[PDB]
């Protein structure tokens, strides 16, 4: 089997991407944030504290003839911005782009933090990291991909995120029309539960390539590109007037700037992030200071190849017995 679903930016800055997901019988369609940096599929629901719901579409398990309470199971998860959610668990039928999994753990939110409430466009998360990170207790649950894998034509999914435009998540096949040149594959460590890999270096604009190992994670659920302070300083030094602002929380730059590209290495191959992809717009409405899309990972504890990087590539998440990651230009 295979599946194919369009993923769409939630706003004009590509702050996140939503993908429609069918849950239950009859189908209830929710728009979920596919997150290769976590391993829980959770949704706003009829159980979510009413004051914490503001415009999201909810899953109502009592209206699904295939929903079953997973007795005794609870979940609780936190994210990189300090947001969090928690609740109980149902199993139900879940379909993505025509690919159906029966008995999928659907984590129903009883509580969500303010940032989730405040974002009416995201109805929940669908985790695509390794199932060892799943937070359901006392019996850990499998991700949608893990459950689907045996049925797939090939044990892979691909992320093809758009810049200010829709893109595609495919399951079970590689669309050879969706990229240019060849796909370069690179080793993955699953030791921390992430799609963790090592970039071979970087270049800023038309500058020379610096060969240096950068360990990080391929994370569709993180908006920006977080890299070591040395690398980030080298990038922003090429933008007149750019500076790190403790008050804003990162590098900012004059909105009048033309940003240089940023290249990262995948083995001997190179992925070029155009400068425009690194512009996240005014820090507040009407400001002439703009927020940068490349930020320091110092104090995060890990480097993160988030959407800024991934949307410049066609990315293969290869879930074979020994997982790997593939990157192609597009």
């Amino acid at each position: 089997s295979t599946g194919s679903a369009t993923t769409t930016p939630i706003d004009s800055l590509d702050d996140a991407y939503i993908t429609p997901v069918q849950i239950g019988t009859p189908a209830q369609t929710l728009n979920l944030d596919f997150d290769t940096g976590s391993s829980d599929l959770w949704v706003f629901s009829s159980e979510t504290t009413a004051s914490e719901v503001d415009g999201q579409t909810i899953y109502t398990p009592s209206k699904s003839t295939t929903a079953k309470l997973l007795s005794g199971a609870t979940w609780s998860i936190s994210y990189g911005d300090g947001s969090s959610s928690s609740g109980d668990v149902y199993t139900d039928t879940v379909s993505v782009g025509g690919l159906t999994v029966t008995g999928q753990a659907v984590e129903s939110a009883k509580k969500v933090s303010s940032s989730f409430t405040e974002d009416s466009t995201i109805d929940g998360l669908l985790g695509l990291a390794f199932s060892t990170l799943n937070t359901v207790s006392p019996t850990q649950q499998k991700t949608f991909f893990d459950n689907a894998k045996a049925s797939l034509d090939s044990p892979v999914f691909t992320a093809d995120l758009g810049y200010h435009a829709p893109g595609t998540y495919n399951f079970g096949f590689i669309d050879t029309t969706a990229y240019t040149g060849s796909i370069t594959y690179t080793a993955v460590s699953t030791k921390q539960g992430f799609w963790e890999w090592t970039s071979t270096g970087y270049a800023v604009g038309s500058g020379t390539f610096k060969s240096t190992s950068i360990d990080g994670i391929a994370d569709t659920g993180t908006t920006l590109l977080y890299l070591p302070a040395t690398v980030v300083s080298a990038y922003w030094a090429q933008v007149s007037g750019a500076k790190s602002s403790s008050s804003v929380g990162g590098y900012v730059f004059p909105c009048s700037a033309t940003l240089p590209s940023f290249t990262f290495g995948v083995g001997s191959a190179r992925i070029v992030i155009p400068g425009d992809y690194i512009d996240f717009g005014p820090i507040s409405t009407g400001s002439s200071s703009c927020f940068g899309g490349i930020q320091s990972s110092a104090g995060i504890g890990i480097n993160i190849f988030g959407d800024v990087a991934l949307k410049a590539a066609f990315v293969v998440f290869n879930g074979a017995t020994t997982p790997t990651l593939g990157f192609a230009s597009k």
Side-chain angles (χ1 to χ4, degrees), residues 33-62 64-67 69-109 112-141 143-148 150-190 192-222:
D33 184 350
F34 283 24
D35 179 12
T36 63
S38 70
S39 305
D40 287 48
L41 191 176
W42 74 260
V43 296
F44 278 80
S45 75
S46 56
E47 302 182 326
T48 310
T49 301
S51 64
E52 295 177 352
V53 183
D54 188 4
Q56 296 80 10
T57 296
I58 64 167
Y59 168 59
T60 303
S62 68
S64 173
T65 58
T66 40
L69 180 70
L70 185 64
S71 182
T74 59
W75 62 279
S76 178
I77 187 165
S78 300
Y79 296 92
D81 61 350
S83 66
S84 62
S85 53
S86 63
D88 55 17
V89 187
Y90 292 82
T91 57
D92 210 338
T93 302
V94 172
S95 300
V96 177
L99 172 63
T100 301
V101 169
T102 57
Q104 174 65 45
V106 178
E107 303 172 33
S108 167
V112 305
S113 67
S114 57
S115 288
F116 284 114
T117 299
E118 289 158 3
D119 181 10
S120 65
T121 70
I122 291 176
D123 301 325
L125 268 69
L126 189 150
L128 292 168
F130 293 89
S131 293
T132 53
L133 294 181
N134 176 266
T135 78
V136 178
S137 178
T139 308
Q140 191 171 61
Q141 301 294 304
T143 70
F144 176 82
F145 178 53
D146 207 344
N147 282 322
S151 300
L152 295 177
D153 290 358
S154 181
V156 306
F157 68 90
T158 65
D160 181 8
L161 302 179
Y163 167 67
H164 295 177
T168 305
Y169 282 103
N170 291 329
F171 292 83
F173 72 105
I174 287 158
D175 180 356
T176 59
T177 72
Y179 58 88
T180 62
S182 50
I183 306 177
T184 297
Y185 290 85
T186 196
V188 164
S189 172
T190 63
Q192 295 195 101
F194 299 117
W195 294 90
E196 185 173 3
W197 65 290
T198 302
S199 171
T200 49
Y202 70 97
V204 176
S206 62
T208 63
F209 187 84
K210 176 74 170 181
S211 293
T212 184
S213 294
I214 304 172
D215 181 286
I217 65 169
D219 184 4
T220 59
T222 290

